[PDB]
Amino acid sequence: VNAPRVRRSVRDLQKRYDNGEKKPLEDLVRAWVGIQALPPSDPKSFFALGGYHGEPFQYRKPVDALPQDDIYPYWGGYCNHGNVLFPTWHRMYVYKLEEALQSIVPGVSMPFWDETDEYTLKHGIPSILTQEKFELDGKQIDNPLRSFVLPVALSDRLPGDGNIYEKPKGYVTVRYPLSGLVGTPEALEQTKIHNAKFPLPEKNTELLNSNVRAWLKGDSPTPGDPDPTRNGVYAKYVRCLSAPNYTVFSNTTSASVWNSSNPGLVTPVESPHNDIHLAVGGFDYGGDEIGQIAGANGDMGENNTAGMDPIFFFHHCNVDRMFWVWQKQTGHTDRLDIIRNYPGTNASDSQGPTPGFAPGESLNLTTPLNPFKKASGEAYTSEDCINIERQLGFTYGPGSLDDATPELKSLLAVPSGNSTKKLTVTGIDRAQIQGSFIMKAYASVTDANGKTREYYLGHKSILSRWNVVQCANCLTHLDIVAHFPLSAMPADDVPKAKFRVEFIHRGGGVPSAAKAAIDKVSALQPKFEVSDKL
Amino acid sequence: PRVRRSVRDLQKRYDNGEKKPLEDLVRAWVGIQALPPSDPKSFFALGGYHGEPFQYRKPVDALPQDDIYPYWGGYCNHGNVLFPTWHRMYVYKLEEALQSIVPGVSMPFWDETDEYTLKHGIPSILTQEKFELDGKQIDNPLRSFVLPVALSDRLPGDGNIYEKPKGYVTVRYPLSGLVGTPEALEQTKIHNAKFPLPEKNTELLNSNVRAWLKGDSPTPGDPDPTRNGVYAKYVRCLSAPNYTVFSNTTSASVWNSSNPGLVTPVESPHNDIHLAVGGFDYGGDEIGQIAGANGDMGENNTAGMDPIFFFHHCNVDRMFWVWQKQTGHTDRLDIIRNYPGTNASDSQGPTPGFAPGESLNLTTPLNPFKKASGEAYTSEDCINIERQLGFTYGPGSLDDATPELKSLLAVPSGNSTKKLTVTGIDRAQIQGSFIMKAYASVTDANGKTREYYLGHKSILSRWNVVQCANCLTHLDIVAHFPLSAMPADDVPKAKFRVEFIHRGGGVPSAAKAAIDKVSALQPKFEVS
Numbered sequence A: 001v002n003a004p005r006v007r008r009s010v011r012d013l014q015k016r017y018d019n020g021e022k023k024p025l026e027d028l029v030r031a032w033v034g035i036q037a038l039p040p041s042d043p044k045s046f047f048a049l050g051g052y053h054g055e056p057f058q059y060r061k062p063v064d065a066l067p068q069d070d071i072y073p074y075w076g077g078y079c080n081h082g083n084v085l086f087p088t089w090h091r092m093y094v095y096k097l098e099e100a101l102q103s104i105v106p107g108v109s110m111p112f113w114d115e116t117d118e119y120t121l122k123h124g125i126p127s128i129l130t131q132e133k134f135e136l137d138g139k140q141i142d143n144p145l146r147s148f149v150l151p152v153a154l155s156d157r158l159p160g161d162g163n164i165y166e167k168p169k170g171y172v173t174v175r176y177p178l179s180g181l182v183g184t185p186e187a188l189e190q191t192k193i194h195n196a197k198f199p200l201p202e203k204n205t206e207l208l209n210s211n212v213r214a215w216l217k218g219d220s221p222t223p224g225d226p227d228p229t230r231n232g233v234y235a236k237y238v239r240c241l242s243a244p245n246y247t248v249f250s251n252t253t254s255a256s257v258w259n260s261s262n263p264g265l266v267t268p269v270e271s272p273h274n275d276i277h278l279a280v281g282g283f284d285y286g287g288d289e290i291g292q293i294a295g296a297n298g299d300m301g302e303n304n305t306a307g308m309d310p311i312f313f314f315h316h317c318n319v320d321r322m323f324w325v326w327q328k329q330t331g332h333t334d335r336l337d338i339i340r341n342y343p344g345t346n347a348s349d350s351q352g353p354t355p356g357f358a359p360g361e362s363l364n365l366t367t368p369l370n371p372f373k374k375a376s377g378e379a380y381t382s383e384d385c386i387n388i389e390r391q392l393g394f395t396y397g398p399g400s401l402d403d404a405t406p407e408l409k410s411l412l413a414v415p416s417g418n419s420t421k422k423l424t425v426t427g428i429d430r431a432q433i434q435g436s437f438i439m440k441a442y443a444s445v446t447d448a449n450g451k452t453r454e455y456y457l458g459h460k461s462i463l464s465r466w467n468v469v470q471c472a473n474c475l476t477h478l479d480i481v482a483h484f485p486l487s488a489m490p491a492d493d494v495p496k497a498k499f500r501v502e503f504i505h506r507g508g509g510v511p512s513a514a515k516a517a518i519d520k521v522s523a524l525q526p527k528f529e530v531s532d533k534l
Numbered sequence B: 001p002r003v004r005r006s007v008r009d010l011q012k013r014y015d016n017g018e019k020k021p022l023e024d025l026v027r028a029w030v031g032i033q034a035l036p037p038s039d040p041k042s043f044f045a046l047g048g049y050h051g052e053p054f055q056y057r058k059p060v061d062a063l064p065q066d067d068i069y070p071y072w073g074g075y076c077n078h079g080n081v082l083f084p085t086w087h088r089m090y091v092y093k094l095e096e097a098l099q100s101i102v103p104g105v106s107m108p109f110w111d112e113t114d115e116y117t118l119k120h121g122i123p124s125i126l127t128q129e130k131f132e133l134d135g136k137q138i139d140n141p142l143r144s145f146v147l148p149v150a151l152s153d154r155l156p157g158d159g160n161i162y163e164k165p166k167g168y169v170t171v172r173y174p175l176s177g178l179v180g181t182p183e184a185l186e187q188t189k190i191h192n193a194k195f196p197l198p199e200k201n202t203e204l205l206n207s208n209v210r211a212w213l214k215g216d217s218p219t220p221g222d223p224d225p226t227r228n229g230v231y232a233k234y235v236r237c238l239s240a241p242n243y244t245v246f247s248n249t250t251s252a253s254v255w256n257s258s259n260p261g262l263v264t265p266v267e268s269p270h271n272d273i274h275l276a277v278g279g280f281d282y283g284g285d286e287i288g289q290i291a292g293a294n295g296d297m298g299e300n301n302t303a304g305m306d307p308i309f310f311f312h313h314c315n316v317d318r319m320f321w322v323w324q325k326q327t328g329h330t331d332r333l334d335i336i337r338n339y340p341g342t343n344a345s346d347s348q349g350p351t352p353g354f355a356p357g358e359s360l361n362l363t364t365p366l367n368p369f370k371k372a373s374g375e376a377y378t379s380e381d382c383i384n385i386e387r388q389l390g391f392t393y394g395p396g397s398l399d400d401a402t403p404e405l406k407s408l409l410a411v412p413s414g415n416s417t418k419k420l421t422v423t424g425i426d427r428a429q430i431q432g433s434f435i436m437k438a439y440a441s442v443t444d445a446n447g448k449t450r451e452y453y454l455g456h457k458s459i460l461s462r463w464n465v466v467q468c469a470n471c472l473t474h475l476d477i478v479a480h481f482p483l484s485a486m487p488a489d490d491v492p493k494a495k496f497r498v499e500f501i502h503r504g505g506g507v508p509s510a511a512k513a514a515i516d517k518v519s520a521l522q523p524k525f526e527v528s
C-alpha cells in the first residue's frame, strides 16, 4: 500500500559517508549500538536475537539419551536449514532484527553486504564491517559491527559439566583466521595455540579479505579485473537465480535429490550462502591438497553461534535480496509452491526438528516460523512474507546480479567440446562428523607420456553444527551425496579420469579427535558415477 | 604367613644400613606403574577399580529430579557393611600385582597413629621426590602417579570434572587437581599458584595431618592427642560392639540415633585421613567455608590413583584385623539383616551390576576381584587373613587396649556423658566431600561466656556430574557429638552451632550459591 523502505548496499552507505553524507551510516551504527546495549532478557536485544538462530538451545533430553540405533538428530535453535523454510525463516529473522534496530532509530533499514558486487570481488569485505572504530556524536566508539561481546554466558549450567557449546560471559565473536571454540579444556587450549599464530588485527583483516575474494573467484585472486571462474561463490549465486522452482531453490536437501533425478545441476540459494559462512567463519578456500584441517573455529563457521556475529545479518540481508531477485526473475513475487513430501519438506530432514516439532512432521507455507510473532501475538508463517513490498513494507535497492544478462548465461555455459555430464559422489558410509566441512572434487588424466593433468570440478560446502553426544558410538549418521559438473574437462577425457574428493574439515576442533580424522577420512573410499550427456 | 609392616619401620631399617625391604617395595611399585593401562595388574587399572573410570546408567542419569537416585560407577563400597572387606581385598589384590614384579613382597601400612606421625606427619618415603634404586636416582613412585592415558568418557564435544588428561599428576593438600572443565582448570591454576614450593607444601600437609590426629593446633613438645582428634576416633572405633556398626558410617549413625552413648565405625577416622591428605584444613573454619585444594584423595572419584591410598588402606585393614582380634571375630562376622548399611541403595548408591533395593551380605561378590579359579571373591573368602589370604599385621600403634587409651576417651569427672544430635539439615545437595565441626557457647547471668569444641565429622563423598539443575544427590545430614568437653551444669544453658567446610560446588560459578545455602541452614539441636 505505502511506498517501500529501501534496503541499500552497505558499500553504498559507506561511500555516501566517505563523501560527507554521514547520516545513513550513523543511524545504522547508532541502532546497532542501541540493540547491543539492551539487557539480554529483552526480546529485542542483540543477544536474544542472535540467540534465536542457534544457541542457547532447547534440548530433548529423552532423545539425547536414546541408544545408537534409535537416536536421531534434532536442532535446539529455531533457524531452518536444509529444508524449504530456509529462505522464509531467514527473511523473517532479518526483518525481526530490523524491527529491533528501529526501536532505537525509527525507520532505519538493515542494509545488505553485496557479496557479488565489484568491490567485494576486488577488495573483500567493506571496512565498515571490519574496522575497529567509528565516530558517532563526535566521540570515538568501538564499531559494534566488527564483533560482539556476550553480556552473559552461553551455558547449560549443568553441575560438573562443560562442553563445546559453552562460551563464557565476555566472549568476543571471531572470524577467520581466528578460533573461538572454548568450552572444553582441549578446545580452549587448541584455540590459544591457533590464535597465537595470528596476533596482528590488520594482517588478520587482509587474510580474511583475501579468503573472501578467493572463495568468490573460485581460484587465488588475481589483481586487475577480478575474473570469477565458474566454480566460485560468484558463479554459484548466479546459478541459484536459475533454479527452476521454489522447492529446489530453497535448500540443499531438495536440490540434491532433484539433481539425482533430473538432468543438469540446480543450485539452491542455501549453497552459496553456506560458502560465505565457511569463508568468513574459518575455512581457507585452499587448494589441491589431499585433505586439510580448518582450525579457525570462528562463530560464522557453524550454525551454533553464527547469529552472535553482526555480519550474520548483513550477509543474510544479501541472501534475502537474492531470494527476492529470484522471486522477480521467475514470477514468484506473490506466490510460492512447495512439492508435498519432497525431501526438504520434513522436520526430520537435515538438521532435524526445531523446538516443538516432531519427527516426520510436514513443513509447508503454513508452518509457524518460530519464534516470530505478528502484533496479534500470532506466529508468522511463510504465507505472511512472500512479497516483501506488499506484506513487509520494504524493497531492495539496486545491486549486483539484479538482471539476467548474456555475460552471465555464458559464464554458466559448458565451453564447446567440454563435458556436459555430471559426477555423482557417494561415500554414503560413516559420516560421524563434528562441525562444517567442504568437499572439493578433482579429475586427473594421465596421457601416454606419463604427464598428469588435474581438473578442478568445484566445491560443496556443508554448513553444519558442533555436536555434544552422550554415546561414543553414534554421533549422527548421514548420506554423503554430492554432484559436480564435469564442464572443466574435454568431453572425450571423462572416460580416462581418475576422480578424488578432498575433504576440508574441523577434525573435532581438538587433539583428542584428530587421530580419528587423519586415519578415518583416509579410510573412506567414495564411489564415483558419471551421468549421461544432456 | 607373610608380615605387613609399618613403612616407617622399613624406612628406619633403610637409614640403618638394611635397604632391601624399602628397595623391594619401591622396585615393585615402579614395576606396576610401568605396566600398560590395559593390564589388570597395572597400577592404572588397579587405581581405576576404586572409582573412575566409571560405568554409567544412562537411563538413570536422564531421570527427572523427583525420580533420580544416586549410584556409584566405581567398584568401591562405601557407607555399607562391605566397606572393610572390599578394601581388604582391594589392598590384597594390589599386593598381588606388586608380587608380579618382586615375588613374596608385602604391602606395608602407614601407621597413622604411631609416635612419628603424631609428631612429624607422613613418613618422608611417601612424600620424598627421589629414590636411590640400583645406585641410580629415580623418581619416587609413592609420591604421586602420572596418568598413562586420560581419564575420559570419550564423549565428543563434552568435558566434565570427572575427566583428567593424559600426563595428569596426582596431588595432595594443599594442591588442587580438578581440571576437566575450563573453569575448574582455571581455578585449579589460580589455587595452585598460591602454593608454589614443593618443600613448603610438604610441610603444610604434615602440619594438617598432625592437626587432624591431635584434634587441635599441633604442639611442639609431646603430641598430646585430645579426645576430638583422629587418634581418639581410631581408638573409639576398636570398641565398636558389633561388625555391622564397626564397618560403616550408615550403620553407626542409626545405631547412635537408637542407643545410648556413641560408636565410631572404622570408616569414620578413615574418612578423616582422606580429607586431611586430600584437601581439607582441620582449622579451615577459622578462615572460610570453602576447601579449594581439590586433591585426588579428598573424594572417592580418583583417590585410588594416589599411591598413598594403599598405604592408608593397609592401615585401615590393620585396624579391622585388630578389632577382629580384640573382639574375637578373627573367623566369623555377623550382619544385622536389613539394618541401614546392608542395602545397595544406602549412601553412595549401587555399584555396577547391583539394583536399587538389593541386599548386601557376606556372600555378596566383591567385584571385580576374582580367585585363580575365575570365581568372584566374597567377604567369606577374606575374614581370617592368616588362614585364607596368607598374611598377618606386624606390630604397630593401638593394637592393645590400655588404661591410657581408656582414660583418653573417658568423661572428666563432673563433665556431661550426654550426646548432641544435629539435624534439621534435610535434603542438602552434594558436590564433593565436606566436614562439620560442632561447638557450644554458654553464657552466665553475670555475662561471662565459655566456648566448647565438641568435635568433627568427615563426610567423604564424590564429585558429581548431572544432567539437570536440581539433579544432584540429596542428603539428610545427621551428626552426633559427645558432650564430654562440657561441665554437666553448663549443658542446659548451652547454645549450639555447627560450621561446615565444603567444596563450594567445585568451581567459582557454583560457589556463591553453595555459601548462601550453608549460611541459611538453621540446624536443630537435640540433647539426649
Ligand SMILES: [Cu+2]
Residues within 6 Å of the ligand: A053, A079, A080, A081, A090, A303
Ligand atoms: Cu541460519
Ligand SMILES: [Cu+2]
Residues within 6 Å of the ligand: A273, A277, A316
Ligand atoms: Cu546463514
Ligand SMILES: [Cu+2]
Residues within 6 Å of the ligand: B050, B076, B077, B078, B087, B300
Ligand atoms: Cu574406597
Ligand SMILES: [Cu+2]
Residues within 6 Å of the ligand: B270, B274, B313
Ligand atoms: Cu579410603
Ligand SMILES: [O]
Residues within 6 Å of the ligand: A079, A303
Ligand atoms: O545460516
Ligand SMILES: [O]
Residues within 6 Å of the ligand: B076, B078, B300, B303
Ligand atoms: O575410601
